[PDB]
Amino acid sequence: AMADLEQKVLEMEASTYDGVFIWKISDFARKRQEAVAGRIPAIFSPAFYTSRYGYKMCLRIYLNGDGTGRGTHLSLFFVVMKGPNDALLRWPFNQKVTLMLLDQNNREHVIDAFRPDVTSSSFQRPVNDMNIASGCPLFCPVSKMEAKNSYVRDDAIFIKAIVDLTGL
C-alpha cells in the first residue's frame, strides 16, 4: 500500500485545477538516453484539470519522438483521461489545447496549439482509464534542445500545457 499511497500523494501534489499545468522533468539526460535505447520510450505526466470538477487530463512525451517524429523529434501528446465527474461534462472534449517547451532563458519558447477533432476517439467520453493520446509528433527537433541551447538547464526541462476554458 505504502507504494500506492505515495503515488496518490505525488498525484495530488502535482494536480492543478485551472487548465494550466507545468511539467518539470529532472534527470533529463538519463531519461533522454532511456528514450534512445528504447528502454523507456514515453513518460506520462501527473493528472491536472480544467476546474475543480472539470475534465481530467495529462500529457505523454517521447524524449526521442514517436511516429513521424521518432529518433529525430520530441513528441508531446495531450491525453484525455476518465474523470470522476465525466457524467457531468459536455462531450466530446472540444477545448483548444496549447502546449509549450519552456526556454529557461526566456527568449524563445517552443509553442504549438490545436483544436480537438470532435470525431477523434481521443476526445470522446472515456471508457478506458485513458483515451488515445494525440498532440504534436514533431513538437520540437532534438537538436533544438539536447546539446545545450536554453531549454535544458541544470539537467531539467519544463513542459507547459494550457487548456483553453471557453464555454466552461
Partner: peptide, 5 residues
C-alpha cells in the same frame, strides 16, 4: 491533433 502510434 495527430494521435500517437
Amino acid at each position: 491533433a495527430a494521435q500517437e502510434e
